C-alpha cells in the first residue's frame, strides 16, 4: 500500500531533548504515543523503496530468437542422451523421436482416459508416467500457503495435429499426471525445455511429423538457421586422415618427466 | 520531464490481455444479435489527403449520394442493408466515383436479401 506507515501524525522532537531525531507520534494516552515513526528503522513504519506496480514484470524477446530457441529444443528432443540427462526415465521406448500412428489417437480412440493410459504403456512411456506419480511431494517452503502445495516431475509431451487428429485426445491425456498436450502449430518453449533444461520426451504422432516441415516453412521472417559448424563431432575434425597427415611431430608427452 | 507529480498519474496496462477478451466477446455478442449479417458495415475506398500519403488509399466513412444513386441503391435503404452513408463527402473527380460504384456493384453481387415478414 502506498499509505503504509504514513497514516500517522508524527513530529520530530528536535535538538532540544536527549533523544534521537526521529519523528515521534503525538498524544499522551496510549502505548503508541512517543514512539518513532515514518522510517525504515522503525516498527510499524514505512519500508525502504516501497514496491511499485510499474516494475518491469514482462520481458520482450525477439521473435527470431524465440523461434531459434524452439528449433533448438525440438532438435534436442531428438537426441537420446539429452532425454535421460533431463531426468526422463527413457529406457524402454524403441525410437527416441517416438512417432505413433495417428489412426491410434485420432477421434474417440484416446478420448477415454483409460485408453490413453494403455497406449502410453504399449509404446514404452510407462516408466515416465509412473515416475511422475511416485514423485508427488509437498513443497518445501511458504508457497504452500499461496496455492502451490505439491511438486511433481514432468512426463511425456504429446504433440498432435488438430487438423487430422482432433481435440478429443487432449481430454484423455488431461487427467494423467505429468503428461502434457500441445498442437504442432503452437509449440511452447516452456514445455519443450522445462526449467531451461533441454531434452523433453515427446510422443509425436504421424500426422504431426508430416506437418513439421510445413509449420516451419510458413513462419515468415524466419528460416531454419545455418550452423556455424558443419561437422559437430570434433574427434572427426582432429583425428582425420587429412588433418593428421600435415601435423608437426609431437613436442612432448602428456606427462613430463621431472628433469632436476 | 518529472517536474510534476508523475507518481500520482502513472497508468499500467495489466488489463491488456483482459480487455482483448472483452473486445472479442463484444464482437461475438454483436454477432449473436446480427446472426446472418456481417458485424461491420460496408465502407468506401478513399484517398488519403496530404502529399505524403496521396499514393496510399484507405477506407472512408460512408458512401456519397452520387455513388449510391449510380450503383442503383436507394439512399433510405442503404443504412438498412449494411452500407454506411456520408453526406459530407463529395466526389470531385470521376476516379473517386468509379471506384466506389464498382465496390457497391460488387457488394450487391455477394449480397443475399431476405423478405420482410
Amino acid at each position: 500500500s502506498e499509505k503504509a506507515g504514513h497514516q500517522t501524525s508524527a513530529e520530530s522532537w528536535g535538538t532540544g531533548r536527549a533523544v534521537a531525531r526521529i519523528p515521534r507520534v503525538s498524544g499522551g494516552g496510549t502505548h503508541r504515543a512517543g514512539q518513532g515513526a515514518f522510517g525504515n528503522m522503525c516498527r510499524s513504519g514505512r519500508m525502504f523503496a516501497p514496491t511499485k506496480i510499474w516494475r518491469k514484470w514482462h520481458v520482450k524477446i525477439n521473435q527470431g530468437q524465440k523461434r531459434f530457441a524452439t528449433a533448438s529444443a525440438l532438435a534436442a528432443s531428438a537426441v537420446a542422451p539429452l532425454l535421460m540427462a533431463r531426468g526422463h526415465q527413457v529406457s524402454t521406448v524403441p525410437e527416441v523421436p517416438l512417432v505413433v500412428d495417428s489412426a491410434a489417437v485420432a477421434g474417440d480412440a484416446v478420448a477415454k482416459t483409460a485408453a490413453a493410459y494403455k497406449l502410453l504403456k504399449a509404446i514404452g512411456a510407462g516408466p515416465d508416467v509412473e515416475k511422475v506419480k511416485k514423485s508427488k511431494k509437498l513443497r518445501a517452503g511458504k508457497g504452500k500457503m499461496r496455492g502451490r502445495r505439491h511438486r511433481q516431475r514432468r512426463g511425456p509431451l504429446i504433440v498432435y495435429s488438430p487438423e487430422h487428429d482432433g481435440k478429443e485426445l487432449v481430454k484423455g491425456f488431461r487427467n494423467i499426471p505429468g503428461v502434457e498436450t500441445c498442437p504442432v502449430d503452437a509449440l511452447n518453449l516452456l514445455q519443450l525445455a522445462p526449467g531451461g533444461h533441454l531434452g523433453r520426451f515427446i510422443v509425436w504422432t504421424s500426422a504431426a511429423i508430416k506437418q513439421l516441415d510445413a509449420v516451419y516453412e510458413s513462419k515468415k521472417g524466419f528460416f531454419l538457421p545455418a550452423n556455424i559448424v558443419s561437422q559437430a563431432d570434433l574427434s572427426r575434425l582432429i583425428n582425420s586422415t587429412e588433418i593428421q597427415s600435415v601435423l608437426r611431430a609431437p613436442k612432448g608427452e602428456a606427462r613430463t618427466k621431472r628433469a632436476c | 520531464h518529472f517536474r510534476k507529480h508523475w507518481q500520482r498519474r502513472v497508468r499500467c496496462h495489466f488489463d491488456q490481455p483482459g480487455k482483448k477478451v472483452t473486445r472479442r466477446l463484444a464482437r461475438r455478442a454483436k454477432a449473436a444479435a446480427l446472426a446472418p449479417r456481417p458485424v461491420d458495415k460496408l465502407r468506401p475506398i478513399v484517398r488519403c489527403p496530404t502529399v505524403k500519403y496521396n499514393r496510399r488509399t484507405r477506407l472512408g466513412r460512408g458512401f456519397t449520394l452520387e455513388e449510391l444513386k449510380a450503383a442503383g441503391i436507394p439512399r433510405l435503404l442503404a443504412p438498412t442493408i449494411g452500407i454506411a452513408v456520408d453526406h459530407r463527402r463529395k466526389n470531385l473527380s470521376e476516379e473517386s466515383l468509379a471506384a466506389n460504384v464498382q465496390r457497391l456493384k460488387d457488394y450487391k453481387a455477394r449480397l443475399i436479401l431476405f423478405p420482410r415478414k
Binding site: S218 | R24, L25, A26, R27, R28, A29, K30, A31, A32, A33, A35, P36, P38, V39, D40, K41, L42, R43, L59, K69, A70, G72, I73, P74, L76, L77, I81, G82, E94, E95, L97, A98, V101, Q102, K105, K108, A109, R110, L111, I112, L113, F114, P115
Partner: protein
Amino acid sequence: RELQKRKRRSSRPTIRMPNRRKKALNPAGNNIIAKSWNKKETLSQNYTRFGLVAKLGKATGGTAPGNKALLSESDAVPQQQQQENHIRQHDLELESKPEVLRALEREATRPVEKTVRHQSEREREWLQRLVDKHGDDVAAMARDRKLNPYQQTASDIKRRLKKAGLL
C-alpha cells in the same frame, strides 16, 4: 473498507451476484444460424462454416489458414463500362457450397405472399356512383364536382377504377 469489515463480522449472509451479462454471447432461436452455430468455435470459425463474411473491412492482422470470414466510348464516360432517373426504393432487384449458405438461399428465394390491399367500402361506393353517371369518360369524372368533391385528376380516378374492377 470500513464497510467491508462490518460484513465480515455480521451474521447477515453475503449476497452472491450471479454471473449475468447484458448481451448474450451465442445466437438462439429456430432459424438456420442458431441451429448450426457451435458453442466452442469463434465468430470467424463459425462464419467460415456458413460461407458468410463476418468483417467487411480490411485485415487488422494475420488470419489463421483456412479462414474465409475476414476478407467504343464516344463520350468519355468512366461509368459506361460498369453499367449493367427512378429506382425501386424498398427492395433490390438482384440476380460444393456450404449447407448453411444453401439453406439461406432457399429462404431468400422462397415465394412470398402478395397481401393485396383492398379499397374501402365507401371508396367503392364513391367510384361506383361515378361509373353510374359518366360511364367510362374519365375527363368528365374529374371535371365533375358533386360526385368528386376532393378534386382528383382523371389519372388518379382511372387507377382506382382499374383496381376495383369497374374498368
